[PDB]
Amino acid sequence: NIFEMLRIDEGLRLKIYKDTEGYYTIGIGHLLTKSPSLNAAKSELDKAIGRNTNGVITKDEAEKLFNQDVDAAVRGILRNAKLKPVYDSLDAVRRAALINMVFQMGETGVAGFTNSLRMLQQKRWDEAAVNLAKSRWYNQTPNRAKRVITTFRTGTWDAYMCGTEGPNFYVPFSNATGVVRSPFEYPQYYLAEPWQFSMLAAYMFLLIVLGFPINFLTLYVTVQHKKLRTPLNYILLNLAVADLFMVLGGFTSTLYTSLHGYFVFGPTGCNLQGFFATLGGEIALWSLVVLAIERYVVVCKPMSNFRFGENHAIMGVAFTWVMALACAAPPLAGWSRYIPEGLQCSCGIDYYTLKPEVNNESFVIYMFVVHFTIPMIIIFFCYGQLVFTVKEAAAQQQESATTQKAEKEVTRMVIIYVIAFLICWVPYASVAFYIFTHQGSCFGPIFMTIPAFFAKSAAIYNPVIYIMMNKQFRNCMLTTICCGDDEASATVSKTETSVIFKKVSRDKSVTIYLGKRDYVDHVSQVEPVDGVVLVDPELVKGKKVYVTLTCAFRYGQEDIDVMGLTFRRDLYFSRVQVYPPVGAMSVLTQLQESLLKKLGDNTYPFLLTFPDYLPCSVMLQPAPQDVGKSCGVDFEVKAFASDITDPEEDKIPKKSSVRLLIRKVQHAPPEMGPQPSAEASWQFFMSDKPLNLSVSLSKEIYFHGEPIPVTVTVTNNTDKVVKKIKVSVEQIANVVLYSSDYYVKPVASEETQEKVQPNSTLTKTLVLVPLLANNRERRGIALDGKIKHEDTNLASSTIIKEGIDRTVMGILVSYHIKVKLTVSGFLGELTSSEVATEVPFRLMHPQPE
Ligand SMILES: *[C@@H]1O[C@H](CO)[C@@H](O[C@@H]2O[C@H](CO)[C@@H](O)[C@H](O)[C@H]2NC(C)=O)[C@H](O)[C@H]1NC(C)=O
Numbered sequence: 001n002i003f004e005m006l007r008i009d010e011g012l013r014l015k016i017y018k019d020t021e022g023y024y025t026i027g028i029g030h031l032l033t034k035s036p037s038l039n040a041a042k043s044e045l046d047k048a049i050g051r052n053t054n055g056v057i058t059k060d061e062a063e064k065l066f067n068q069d070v071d072a073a074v075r076g077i078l079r080n081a082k083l084k085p086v087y088d089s090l091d092a093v094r095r096a097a098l099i100n101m102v103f104q105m106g107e108t109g110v111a112g113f114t115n116s117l118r119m120l121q122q123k124r125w126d127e128a129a130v131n132l133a134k135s136r137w138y139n140q141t142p143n144r145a146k147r148v149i150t151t152f153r154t155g156t157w158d159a160y161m162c163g164t165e166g167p168n169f170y171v172p173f174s175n176a177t178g179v180v181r182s183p184f185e186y187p188q189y190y191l192a193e194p195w196q197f198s199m200l201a202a203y204m205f206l207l208i209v210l211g212f213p214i215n216f217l218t219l220y221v222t223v224q225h226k227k228l229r230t231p232l233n234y235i236l237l238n239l240a241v242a243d244l245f246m247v248l249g250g251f252t253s254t255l256y257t258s259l260h261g262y263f264v265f266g267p268t269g270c271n272l273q274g275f276f277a278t279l280g281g282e283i284a285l286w287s288l289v290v291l292a293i294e295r296y297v298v299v300c301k302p303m304s305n306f307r308f309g310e311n312h313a314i315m316g317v318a319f320t321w322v323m324a325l326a327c328a329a330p331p332l333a334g335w336s337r338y339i340p341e342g343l344q345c346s347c348g349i350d351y352y353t354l355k356p357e358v359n360n361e362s363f364v365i366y367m368f369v370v371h372f373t374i375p376m377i378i379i380f381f382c383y384g385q386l387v388f389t390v391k392e393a394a395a396q397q398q399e400s401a402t403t404q405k406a407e408k409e410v411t412r413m414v415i416i417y418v419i420a421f422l423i424c425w426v427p428y429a430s431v432a433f434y435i436f437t438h439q440g441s442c443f444g445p446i447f448m449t450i451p452a453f454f455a456k457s458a459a460i461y462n463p464v465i466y467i468m469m470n471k472q473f474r475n476c477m478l479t480t481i482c483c484g485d486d487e488a489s490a491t492v493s494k495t496e497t498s499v500i501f502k503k504v505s506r507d508k509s510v511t512i513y514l515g516k517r518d519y520v521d522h523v524s525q526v527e528p529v530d531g532v533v534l535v536d537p538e539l540v541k542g543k544k545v546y547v548t549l550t551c552a553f554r555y556g557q558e559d560i561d562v563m564g565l566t567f568r569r570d571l572y573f574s575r576v577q578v579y580p581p582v583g584a585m586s587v588l589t590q591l592q593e594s595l596l597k598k599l600g601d602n603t604y605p606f607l608l609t610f611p612d613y614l615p616c617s618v619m620l621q622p623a624p625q626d627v628g629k630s631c632g633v634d635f636e637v638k639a640f641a642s643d644i645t646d647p648e649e650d651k652i653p654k655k656s657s658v659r660l661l662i663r664k665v666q667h668a669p670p671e672m673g674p675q676p677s678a679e680a681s682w683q684f685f686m687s688d689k690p691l692n693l694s695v696s697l698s699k700e701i702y703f704h705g706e707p708i709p710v711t712v713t714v715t716n717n718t719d720k721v722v723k724k725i726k727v728s729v730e731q732i733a734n735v736v737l738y739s740s741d742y743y744v745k746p747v748a749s750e751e752t753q754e755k756v757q758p759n760s761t762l763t764k765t766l767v768l769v770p771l772l773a774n775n776r777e778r779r780g781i782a783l784d785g786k787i788k789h790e791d792t793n794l795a796s797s798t799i800i801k802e803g804i805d806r807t808v809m810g811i812l813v814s815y816h817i818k819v820k821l822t823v824s825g826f827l828g829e830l831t832s833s834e835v836a837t838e839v840p841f842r843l844m845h846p847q848p849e
Pocket residue numbers: 164166175178179180181182
């Protein structure tokens with residue numbers, strides 16, 4: 001347009017400069033003053049801008065000086081008697097050309113052209129152009145003139161077009177000089193100085209040297225180590241493959257072209273290089289999106305770990321390739337296109353050129369919204385909510401120091417993930433959007449190379465930031481350069497009567513003793529862990545023996561979950577110093593007295609109490625096909641010796657340490673509650689007549705193996721018939737870790753086909769048998785904790801202490817009887833209305849003699 005004409009012709013200067021005539025000018029052709037003094041020129045500038053510039057101004061202030069000049073130029077023309085009829089006759093493109101003449105020479109200067117202005121009015125475009133070309137004006141600056149003259153002749157912007165537009169390519173350079181040639185056939189060295197091509201060759205070589213091994217090692221090591229093979233890591237493996245396509249297909253070809261200075265492989269090579277570079281980048285993009293989604297759901301909700309198998313991971317990796325091809329395929333298919341970008345040694349999508357045939361307009365918007373903004377929102381939302389959740393969780397437990405340092409590591413890596421994503425895709429998003437809005441303006445080849453730097457650099461630092469920073473991957477990669485617990489490999493539980501059991505450590509310095517594995521949990525109080533620890537004085541000398549009580553909520557795998565930017569949450573933790581003893585135990589138990597006399601002098605007692613806000617020992621049931629999936633709450637009593645002081649728990653010596661799993665179990669209380677009775681009445685929209693139902697049980701509390709009678713009285717006063725009645729025992733498993741989540745899986749059910757007619761009643765008692773044996777080989781069933789691998793029963797109903805301050809975190813189980821009714825629908829026989837009501841009951845272990 002007019003702005004781009006005069007900006008390129010005159011040139012935009014931020015400071016004051018002398019023009020060809022030698023007069024003080026600033027910005028685009030703005031005369032400050034004719035005064036000879038340099039200070040006088042700055043003074044006339046200062047008043048124009050409105051502040052103390054000191055011969056330096058911005059472009060927006062210069063755009064204001066230009067607008068006042070154009071608004072006044074349209075006047076001086078209309079004011080002039082010779083210029084106005086010409087101005088009125090000529091169209092908007094040729095009017096811009098006339099303003100250029102008046103802007104440069106002035107009102108009196110343009111008035112000297114009589115025959116030129118005459119022929120333009122008469123629509124003689126051929127004769128007026130020769131007139132302007134043979135004049136003094138052309139001889140002075142034929143560079144500027146010829147662009148203005150061609151405008152009069154053609155009536156187009158072809159003269160003021162930004163760069164040479166070929167059919168298969170776009171070069172950001174003017175062919176006015178005539179030096180522009182095809183990037184497929186001839187060298188492009190006229191664009192920038194030849195050393196910058198060898199610079200790119202050195203840069204693209206560096207990305208191959210660094211990129212190929214880093215990404216290849218990710219895949220190579222995972223084949224060797226079976227540990228790394230996990231559904232969650234599948235998305236991180238996709239990132240390695242994604243980055244390899246950029247290196248192999250993209251950077252290797254881009255290297256060879258940057259060697260010679262132009263694109264040797266032709267349009268065929270440009271399509272495939274542009275395809276792989278786009279695909280490899282777009283796969284890498286959505287991999288991090290799916291990774292962000294996967295990390296958000298898996299950690300926050302421990303139930304989802306169970307649900308997340310190979311199928312869900314494959315679904316994530318496939319989705320990536322679908323969205324990747326959504327970006328990469330259409331330029332090949334013809335929507336937009338693949339052309340050489342920047343120095344034209346590297347091919348990429350066409351964001352800068354507006355081509356209406358291939359519709360770059362829709363593709364860039366499609367790119368900006370679908371393939372940029374949506375990944376940006378999701379990643380910032382997922383990792384943003386992820387820190388928000390951990391910040392909330394760490395705020396609850398301020399006592400556990402391990403949960404505090406994790407939150408520190410979480411916030412660290414997320415900020416790095418933000419920075420990694422921002423450095424990569426913002427340059428393209430800024431530039432392509434700027435070019436789309438500012439398309440009238442011109443941009444060089446180096447302008448497009450700056451975003452190309454960062455996205456191609458992401459093939460290096462995204463592997464490092466996402467993979468190398470992860471602890472499980474980092475450790476395995478070290479063992480690869482190293483080219484390669486085993487010594488001891490002994491961890492057994494023994495037993496002797498005097499019934500007591502013990503366990504010896506690996507180094508056999510610290511030996512622990514305990515009374516019983518199952519500790520009875522009452523409502524008011526809890527039965528504490530009682531026992532002793534035999535310490536070897538020779539092996540443990542000048543060291544610190546400790547004992548712990550670890551209540552840990554366990555979900556998923558030890559390796560990958562800890563790698564997952566956080567680790568499994570320790571629910572409760574306690575510590576006591578065993579040796580050397582500080583003071584002594586005020587009162588011992590009958591067990592401790594026996595073991596002290598039985599064992600030698602180096603034995604020391606300990607006692608570990610439980611608070612009232614802890615859950616029971618509960619684990620979720622895995623399916624037979626599910627091997628590595630593991631989730632549940634469990635209690636662990638550990639003992640160890642260490643040189644380091646009390647605070648260090650996360651890191652301890654494995655050889656000195658010894659541990660034994662225990663249970664916290666609730667037996668059924670002596671008081672069986674009142675006879676459960678539920679009652680409800682139901683109606684319809686068309687039919688307003690009532691339907692009464694009354695459920696009744698025998699006991700409030702039931703035992704495992706005990707039959708549950710459900711007495712149901714269906715009183716039918718309505719017009720419809722009841723087809724069948726179904727009773728169901730349903731197991732509510734309320735999981736509280738980062739959030740409260742209710743999950744209902746029916747454990748047992750019985751039904752009957754007895755029909756109930758209108759104005760007729762039926763009383764029926766159906767027995768249900770809630771046993772695990774029938775429910776074996778299922779998913780998500782809550783079970784009582786099993787010592788080792790032994791047979792266990794369905795999870796006991798968890799009783800919470802009345803009136804407590806802290807929220808109970810863990811797996812909280814509850815049962816109820818759902819009496820389901822199937823009634824014939826009013827519209828049709830096939831139509832049906834399922835009605836149901838619930839009543840709670842307890843299922844727990846009996847108290848032994
Ligand atoms: C930029 O201008 C040059 C010089 O005019 C073009 O090169 C000529 O293109 C014409 C097209 O018909 C050929 O007939 C001539 O043989 C070419 N000249 C020479 C010396 O080879 C050039 O094609 C323009 N740029 C591009 C890339 O099209």
